[PDB]
Design a protein around this ligand. Structure first.
Ligand SMILES: [Zn+2]
Length: 185
């Protein structure tokens, strides 16, 4: 049977975007998101991170550093009873300085590749799922993927009118999501 999911940006949604974050010391969980994620799991949602990480293509940090940080994030969440169901990332950029990652791709939001991948691997009911992000490109990827509810938060990049045009909900932060969902009945 198919499960509903919350799809999540990383920077600006889960962690404070201090700028090309790739080190444990600069990874700061946003207030209340761990508790919120725990509650979302309890509410029956799969949790799937779908993150653009163009810092890799830019040369700001290596894919290995991202992998190390991601393992740590995964550990840290699991240790607090939050087991992520999937972690997807896109390291690419068409103007990448690092040749290995210099390309157009299907996984860089607004392309919905990461969400489609997660859908297939975890058997996700997209129409009953949510996407949470901070920018237009996230909302565009969500509509392409048939995600039922498109949610912006205010904890990341400043919200643009175009992002709002493409979103259903705007919340202060991911910490507000469980209550907003419960209120839907
Ligand atoms: Zn990609």
């Amino acid at each position: 049977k198919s499960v509903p999911a919350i799809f999540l940006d990383r920077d600006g949604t889960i962690n404070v975007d201090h700028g090309y974050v790739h080190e444990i010391d600069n990874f700061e969980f946003i207030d209340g998101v761990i508790d919120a994620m725990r509650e979302l799991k309890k509410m029956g949602f799969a949790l799937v991170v779908v993150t653009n990480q163009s810092g890799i293509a830019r040369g700001k940090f290596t894919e290995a550093q991202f992998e190390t940080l991601t393992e740590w994030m995964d550990w840290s969440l699991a240790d607090r009873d939050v087991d992520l169901d999937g972690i997807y990332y896109c390291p690419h950029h068409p103007q990448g300085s690092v040749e290995e990652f210099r390309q157009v791709c299907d996984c860089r939001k607004p392309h919905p590749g990461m969400l489609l991948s997660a859908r297939d691997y975890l058997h996700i009911d997209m129409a009953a799922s949510y996407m949470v992000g901070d920018k237009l490109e996230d909302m565009q990827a969500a509509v392409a993927a048939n995600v039922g509810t498109k949610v912006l938060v205010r904890t990341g990049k400043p919200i643009t009118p175009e992002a709002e045009n493409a979103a259903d909900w705007v919340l202060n932060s991911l910490a507000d999501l469980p209550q907003a969902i419960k209120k839907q009945q």
